[PDB]
A = this chain, B = another copy of it.
């Protein structure tokens, strides 16, 4: 209702693997099932938007694409639109290619959207928004003074609602250059629970608290 856009910094993966004394890989892979579960739950709960802070480099981008071509099927099956934010220009044509395609393919779903922040940084997003305005100004730029609406509409998140609740798992209490502009009035939630241990139940408890705050 009042909660339309939930954003999450999924922290605690590698660390969750460490307490089980395991290699970094085990951790993230599990982190990936939570992501799936959490998104499906949000999809089935009338959330309008969920943004997740996704993140030798060529290799990571290999796994990403695999990751996306793999679950491509789960976006269609649960009616979930896909959107990527971040500096995609720094991607291999192949990844940028699969990214753009999953977007095309899912642009049909309008109820729930899952946004993945990839090679994402808020200061960088704002910098690119600025470059966007300098390179292609609004035609009436001359008659303008306040540019907030103009910036809002050039950010990677244009047309998504603002963030209502920004959650960070894993124990740390910092925004980490994530959706700074979009979370200007978001309710902030923090939990020590590591990401791979995070459940829809835990998220249900947090949402319950959210409503309590929202007098």
Contacts and interface: CB of A to CB of B under 8 A. Distances in A.
Contact of A133 (B134, B146, B186): B134
A177 interface: yes
Nearest to A188: B173
Contacts of A176: 184-185
Q: Closest 3 interchain pairs by CB? A: A127-B147, A177-B184, A180-B180
A26 interface: no
Interface string A171-215: 011111100110111111100000000000000000000000100
Contacts of A123: 148, 151, 181, 184
Given A181-B126, A181-B180, A184-B122, A147 B131 contact: yes
Interface in A103-118: none
A41 interface: no
A210 B186 CA distance: 23
Interface residues of A, number: 33
A137 interface: yes
A91 interface: no
Contacts of A137: 134
A78 interface: no
B127 A146 contact: yes
Interface string A120-138: 0011101100110110010
Contacts of A144: 131
> Counting chain B CB atoms within 10 Å of each CB, which of A130, A148, A181, A188 scores highest?
A130
Contacts of A147: 127, 130-131
